[PDB]
């Protein structure tokens, strides 16, 4: 009922903020000359962009009602400034993804709607890779940055 | 300088403005069974996120500053009754963009700025082609729903 | 004389190319893009065969003066496709009757080559008006019922 | 914005003109034995039209209503008496066609129609090409046939 | 016009200018070691006489007279001590070729000159390019040469 | 030593000199609607350009400071007004071509610079090859140009 419809709308949300927040990344990376680390971010955005169009196309087949909200304007690139600031951002941003996957599978559990839960199970599966992912560039991010200079390598060899 | 640097960053906005409104307007299509129409309004939703991208890469290299900003909530959706109204909304959409696109060109124009109107001459073209596609397209709704059912057989075939 | 029919047939192929334009023209400008496409290949196959008696008028000695070719003007008219396939059905039983008068003459000059030249017309003009009388047929049948017309040309 | 609706007109009516003033060429080449020469005429007649087809085109779709007009006879072929008067006709033919399109251009330009700027810009670019390689054509002309038959080789070579 | 002439020619000399300067930026780079640098140069060294060579055929066609005049002496190899400063050179060589193909553009735009605006289109979107790579060169030059080496490693590898 | 490097700087300079004379063959021909020659004209800049790169990377490997000198404005096509004219310029540029190696060669010889003299010999080769070729052009040129008319059709034919 009422609380399960209104997360599965700002689920899709969710993916499309996620969306706009990895185009602000691979915008802060380009215009500061990391190609490498923008075209990674520029992919991540069309991803879940993606995600956002799998839960719109389920619940159309499940007769969920969806509504399109705004999308926010992303707001951590007006105080990002080393690559390090924006992959902190970006770990974030999944930590938030993965909450809001977790609170609609809690309500579909409650109202034992099995075909929903079935959906979220490949998501929960990527989040816990996008996670390990992020924390292990985030990582090395931070102890390359240590030498001036050095993290440049990691975005020439992309 | 100033009036061109704000009007590139709107376009960008507009871009993913229109993205959303022909998902929105592909949600409508889904929710009342015309898979044909809602397919195709997805793939131009796609196509203007790409849009926007293409913005937003020139921008960063012609050191234009993008900053993101909030895509608005599409809003026809709750005023579509029949796909007559929906293709209305995506005419008047379009002939928007067009206009915004214009706006642009006469600012750069303006400014004598021969790389950003070089840029945006493709994209006249393609709103050229565009208004006429959707033109078109509904013409052939409007007529084709003179008759009870019959619509629905060019959503099947089309 | 034979030699004013001859020039006058080339006119004739290029006048009605510049018909079957204006009706693909009006075709695209009311959304019939499907009935445009074929307007338009019938006017390249037009203009191909006013080039065919170009080319065997050079090759006989017949000398051929290009003529004005007409402003069309049965598109001022046009307010359905049933209009637009009625007047090209029309544009095709002139183009016939042009051939004809032109092997009628080419026969009282005995003129052998002429009229073996013309053959291959005089049959492409008996499938084209078969054709096109096909098409109005199944134009004014459909448009009987709203819309329905529309589902054809999307079907084309 | 008569003008522009105007000059559209008049752009596809020169194509056409110009179209039926190569066939003339083609027929006086064919006439007097210049094969290579009357092959080249009847190519560029075929495309001329085709020129005028796609001005047809782009005006269908940006709504600029086309009234096709008469094809004026040519009228250059009859005082036409060697290779060299007919090449010269044509260069002036090409010198017109590219007059024409200035026309148009200047007066896209004056309404500020970008969309009609940029579909002119390849045809501006064509005529430049043409211009150069008529004139070079009618140079190689006027020096060969200085000299008795010589011109007949350059046909023979085509 | 005189100017639009006089405009051109600059330009073709601009293009054979700076393809000596990229030549003598290679130089400096082999003579120091720094091979994968030196590579670059020699490539964009050759490519900026190509654009040399599509001015001068262009011109060619439209019969804007071009006299070739003394491609200068490059004069920055004396001053360069390090990578960096050789590419900040080739940075202000790049906006001096932008500022170049600006002014023709003016002179055309103000001749109402559509085929030259055509024609440098290309050139404006490649300037842009161009501009943002050496860029984006200069500043990971910048930042690896802060630590002793560091940069070596990267001429090797990319 | 001083001389050697001298005459070394000054090879690479002939070669974008007779890189941007063939240039200007190539525009006068092509002014004049002789498009054949023109291309066969740029085909040869391009050409030479090669051959100065080819002496620029020799000697950074072996270690002669090169200074790149200013490429003189082409001179003659100010006053060429038949492709004979132009040919007998190009005749002469590479007449001028074979000096300055044979200069640079003799300078290498007497500082028994015997890497120098190896690297010029496939030079001395293509100077014969080259003088050879233009000069039957040319030959041909002033024979056909007897005919009004007639060396236009080789233009058209030939190239
Ligand atoms: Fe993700
Ligand atoms: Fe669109
Ligand atoms: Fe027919
Ligand atoms: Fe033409
Ligand atoms: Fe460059």
């Not at 706009?20 to 802060?28: K, N």
């Not at 109202?111 to 979220?120: E, G, K, N, P, Y």
């Amino acid at each position: 009922s009422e609380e399960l419809l209104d997360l599965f709308n700002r689920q899709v949300t969710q993916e499309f903020t996620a969306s706009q927040v990895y185009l602000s990344a691979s915008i802060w990376f380009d215009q500061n000359d990391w190609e490498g680390m923008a075209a990674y971010m520029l992919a991540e955005s069309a991803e879940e962009r993606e995600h956002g169009l799998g839960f719109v196309d389920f619940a159309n087949k499940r007769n969920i009602p969806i509504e399109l909200q705004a999308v926010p304007a992303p707001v951590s690139c007006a105080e990002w400034s080393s690559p390090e600031d924006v992959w902190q951002s970006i770990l974030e941003l999944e930590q938030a993804n993965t909450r809001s996957l977790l609170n609609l599978a809690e309500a579909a559990s409650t109202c034992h709607d099995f075909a929903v839960m079935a959906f979220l199970n490949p998501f929960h599966l990527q989040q816990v890779n996008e996670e390990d992912k992020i924390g292990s560039i985030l990582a090395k991010v931070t102890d390359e940055n240590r030498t001036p200079g050095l993290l440049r390598s990691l975005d020439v060899v992309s």
